[PDB]
Amino acid sequence: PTINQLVRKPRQSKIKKSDSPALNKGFNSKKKKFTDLNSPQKRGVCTRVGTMTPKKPNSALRKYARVRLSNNIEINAYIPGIGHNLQEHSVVLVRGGRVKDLPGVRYHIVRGALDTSGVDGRRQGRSLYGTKKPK
Amino acid sequence: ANIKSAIKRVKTTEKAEARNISQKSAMRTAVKNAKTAVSNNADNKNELVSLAVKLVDKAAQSNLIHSNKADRIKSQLMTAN
Amino acid sequence: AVKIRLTRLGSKRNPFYRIVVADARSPRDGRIIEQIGTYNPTSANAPEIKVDEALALKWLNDGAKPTDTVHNILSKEGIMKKFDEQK
Amino acid sequence: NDRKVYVGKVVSDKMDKTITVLVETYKTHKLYGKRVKYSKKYKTHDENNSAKLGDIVKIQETRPLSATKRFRLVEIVEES
RNA sequence: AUGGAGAGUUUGAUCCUGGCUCAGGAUGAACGCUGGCGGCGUGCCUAAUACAUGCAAGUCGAGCGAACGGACUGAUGUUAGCGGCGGACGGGUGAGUAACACGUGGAUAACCUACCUAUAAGACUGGGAUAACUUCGGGAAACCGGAGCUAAUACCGGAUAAUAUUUUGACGCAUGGUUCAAAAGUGAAAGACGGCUGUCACUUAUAGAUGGAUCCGCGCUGCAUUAGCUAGUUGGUAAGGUAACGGCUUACCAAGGCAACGAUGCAUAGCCGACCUGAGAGGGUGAUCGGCCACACUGGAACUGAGACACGGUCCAGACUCCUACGGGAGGCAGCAGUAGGGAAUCUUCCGCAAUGGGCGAAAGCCUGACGGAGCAACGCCGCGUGAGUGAUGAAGGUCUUCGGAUCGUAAAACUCUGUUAUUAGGGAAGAACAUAUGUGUAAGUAACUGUGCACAUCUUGACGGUACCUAAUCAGAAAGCCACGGCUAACUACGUGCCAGCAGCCGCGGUAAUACGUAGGUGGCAAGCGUUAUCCGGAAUUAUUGGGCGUAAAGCGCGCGUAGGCGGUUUUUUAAGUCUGAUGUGAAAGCCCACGGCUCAACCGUGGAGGGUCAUUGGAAACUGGAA
C-alpha cells in the first residue's frame, strides 16, 4: 500500500497456532481455573487402552491410549514400541508429536518413565523407547 | 512475633500518645477560644491570642504539628486580630 | 549518613573493591552517588589502590565519613593528611 | 531556570478564566518515517479572559491550577 | 565492505502462485540412555497455597534508679526496669497496577529532610511524678487493678533568644529579594575527664550534602463484533486542611470537561537497563545482577516517629489454625533453612562475622540467615582427562562373500613410555587492612594539662582451611556413551518379518530379495555428554519501510457528490518548524564490541575506550519541505 495507508493501518502479521495445545495449559485446583504454562511434558491417567485403525494409505493396528492429563483435558496418545504394560488407571507421561496416520492422536506416551516400561528387546535406540543398557 | 524491642515500643507509644493528645487538646481549645474572642471583639482577645500563639509554637517544637502548620494557624489568628 | 565505603566487585575468593561515596542506607553493591577510586587487596604483594583527589576532598568537606579501611586507603595517599591541613 | 512555552490556538472559551489551547505538533512514525500531525489540547488560565475562540496565543506552564490547568496565558497576538 | 546459502512437496510431464515441512541459534528447561574431574555461574517459572521446628534486630551501666547480683570497699555483669537511638535500613515476592507505574528530558518564584558537615549564638532558673522495688488482691493462662516509696540526658512551669509569624516603609502571572521599625510568642543536659578546661550530649538559626514529595513534554499491550463517556464531573468564587499546589474536601454559582489523533469498557501485564534471535531493518522476552514501583493471611484505620499509615509494631472486622476452668486468650516463612500440597520440574532444618556493608556504643565489643563461605543437582559455559611411541591394513573371532577373499585394523597382543588424573605422605599462600591499645612528634585550641585531628611504627586476628597449590613414590592401571546411515543430510550390507509387527519432520516405507521396520557387523556425527519434547527468532521477501501484490492464481468498492485527512504548478523576498552542521548537560553502574592486564589457558574477573536519544539548551547554513508577503 501507500505510506499513508501503512501509517493509518500498520501491517498485521499472522498469529501462530501451536500444535499440542494441551501441553500449553495448566490448572489451578484452588481457584478452579485454567492457566497458561507451556510444559515440555504432562502427566495423566489412562482412561482407555486400545487399538486404532490407521489412515487409508497405510494398514496396521496401532496401539493408543485415552489420557486425562493433569489438566481437565482428555487427549489421545500414541504408544511407541512393540510391547506395553498399560491398562486403565495407569499413570503415564505424555509428550508432544502427532501420528500422521491416526486421526485424533496428537501426542506420544513416553516409554521408560513413570509407570511405563520400555521395549523389552530394544538394543539400538534405547534413548527413545525406554529400556536400559543391556549388561 | 513479639521481638523484645517491639514489645517495649508499644508501651512507650501509648505513653507518648497520652502526653501528645493532652497537649494538642489544650492547644486546640486555646485556638478556638482565641478566634471566637476575635470574632466578637471581646476585651480579652489579645492575651487569648497570645495564649494560642504560645501553645501553637510549643507544640510545633514537640513535633505535635509541623512547623509550617503552626504558621498557618498563627498567620490566620493575627490577621483577623 | 553519607559514607565513603568499598563495594565488592570480585568473584569467588578474588575480591575487587571500588572506592565509592554512597548513602549508608543503600545496599553494599547497590545504589551509589559517586565513584572515587579502586582497591585491589589481592594483587602482587602490596594491595594496589587508586584514589582520586579532587572528589575525595570534595566529599570529605561535605561531611562524608570514611569507614575504617577507606580511612587507611585515604591515609596511604596522604588524603587524610591534606584534609587535616585545611583546618 | 526556564518554564516551557507553547503556541497554540484557542478552541474553547466557554469557561470563565479558562481557555483551551490546541497546540498542534508533528510526530514521525517509528517504522515508516512519515511525519504525522498530532494535536494536544492545553487548558490555560487567564484571569482577564480576553482570549476568544480562534485566537493564536502564547502559553507558559505554571504550578497546578485546578484539576487540569497547568498553564497561563502570556500573549495574545491574533484577532480573528 | 567483515555482512545475507537453501532443500523437499500440488502434475502424465512443465512454468508460475501458494501453503506445509526440514536443515541454524537459544532456554531458570523437563524427560530417556549414559556419566570421570575441576573452575566460574545457576537452581519452585506452578499454589501471592498452608505451614511443624530452629535462627533472620538489637544496642548503650561513660544517660540512671535498683530486691539489684556479686570479685575484693565492693572490678564486673542486666539478672529485670526507665530513658536514647535503631526497629521505615538490610532481606523477600510480583499479587495488584495500562498508571506520570516505569524510561528519558525538564520544572517547583507550590515543597519536606533525623543522623552527617560547617558557621554562629547559647545551654539560665524552679517544680511535680513514675517505672524498677515492696505489699495486697483478682484471673485457668494472657495478663489486670489497688496502696507505699525512688532516680534520671524521663516529664512539666517561668527567664532569654533568631532570617520564625503580624503590621510597617524602602518578575516569568501567582512575584521573588534584603534592609527597615514596632508587636506577640518559640529552648536546652548532662555524662565521663584533666588542671578553669578538654571530649561528646543538647537547643536555636542558617547553609551544604543526603534522602524523599509534586507537576509537566515525549515514549510505553490487544480488542471498534468496546462508541459516546463524566457529573467533583469541568471551570470559578469563598472556606477548610496539606510539608506543599491543586475539586484535595465542603458550600454556592455557571454548564461545563474528554472522545475515531480511539473517551469509556473488557482482557492481559510489574516497568527499565538488559537478554535471545536476525546481515540489517526488525521480531520475541523481562530468570540470576543493578535502578524504580507495589505488596506482607484478606480488608479498613490511625499512634509513635525526621521519615510508616509499618514483613519478624498497634486497634477493628473477616477466613482459617491452636489453648481454655467457656469467661476468655494466641498466631501469620512472598526473611534463611526446612515440611506438606500442586507440578514435568528447581537444593542443606550447614559454618562464621575472618573480609565488605549496616545498627548501637567513646571504644573494647554485641547483633547481622545482609554478606563471606561450605552441602546437593552435567542445569549451563569453559578447561583437562579416560592414555602414548614402535608395532603385520595376517593371529583368534564377528560380519559378509562372487568362496578366491574382504572388513573391523596398527585396532590387538607384543615390547618400551608417561602420571594430566588417581592413591598416600610431607610442606602449604594470598585474601590481613584494621579498629583498639601502645609509644613517638605535629596542628588547632590552650593559663596549662588532659583530650581531638593528622603523621609514623609496634602488638595483635582466617569460617573457608591444613582448603587452593607444590614436592616425592606408584599404577596404564579406576575413568564412553548417545544418536544417525533412502532424499533433504555425513555414514550400507546381511539376516528375521511379510501392508503384520512396526517406522515416520515432510516426501513416505512395510504385501517372501526394506541401504525406510527389529537385530548383527560396518560406517558417520558428536562426546561427559547424546537425543526427544516444550517455547522464541531465523530460514519466511509467508505483512514486503528496507523488501510483495490486485486482467485470468487472493485481491479495484456497482457508480457518483463529497467532509476530515494525505499530497500539490513557476518566480522573488523573508523566517527557520522540519532538514543539516557544531558546542554544552545528560542518556547510572553492571551488560554488547574493541584493547589491555590477572587467574598455568579458557570460562571468569578488573581497567580503558567505544557505542547507545524522534533527548534538552544554545550558535551557524538556507537548497528542499513547512510559515508569512
Curated annotation (Swiss-Prot), chain B:
It comes from the Bacteria. Keywords: Ribonucleoprotein, Ribosomal protein, RNA-binding, rRNA-binding. GO terms for biological process: translation. InterPro entries: Ribosomal_bS20, Ribosomal_bS20_sf. GO terms for cellular component: cytosol; small ribosomal subunit. Disulfide bonds: none annotated. SUPFAM superfamilies: Ribosomal protein S20. The keyword rRNA-binding applies. GO terms for molecular function: small ribosomal subunit rRNA binding; structural constituent of ribosome. Binds directly to 16S ribosomal RNA. NCBIfam families: S20. PANTHER family: 30S RIBOSOMAL PROTEIN S20 (PTHR33398), SMALL RIBOSOMAL SUBUNIT PROTEIN BS20C (PTHR33398:SF1). Belongs to the bacterial ribosomal protein bS20 family. This is Small ribosomal subunit protein bS20.
Curated annotation (Swiss-Prot), chain C:
One of its GO terms (biological process) is translation. Pfam families: Ribosomal_S16. The keyword Ribosomal protein applies. Keywords: Ribonucleoprotein, Ribosomal protein. SUPFAM superfamilies: Ribosomal protein S16 (SSF54565). The keyword Secreted does not apply. One of its GO terms (molecular function) is structural constituent of ribosome. HAMAP family: Ribosomal_bS16. Belongs to the bacterial ribosomal protein bS16 family. This is Small ribosomal subunit protein bS16. It comes from Staphylococcus aureus (strain MW2). The gene is rpsP.
Swiss-Prot record, chain D:
Keywords: Ribonucleoprotein, Ribosomal protein, RNA-binding, rRNA-binding. Gene3D superfamilies: Nucleic acid-binding proteins. One of its GO terms (molecular function) is structural constituent of ribosome. One of its GO terms (biological process) is translation. SUPFAM superfamilies: Nucleic acid-binding proteins. One of its GO terms (cellular component) is cytosolic small ribosomal subunit. Belongs to the universal ribosomal protein uS17 family. PANTHER family: 40S RIBOSOMAL PROTEIN S11 FAMILY MEMBER (PTHR10744), SMALL RIBOSOMAL SUBUNIT PROTEIN US17M (PTHR10744:SF1). Part of the 30S ribosomal subunit. One of the primary rRNA binding proteins, it binds specifically to the 5'-end of 16S ribosomal RNA. This is Small ribosomal subunit protein uS17. It comes from Staphylococcus aureus (strain MW2). The gene is rpsQ.
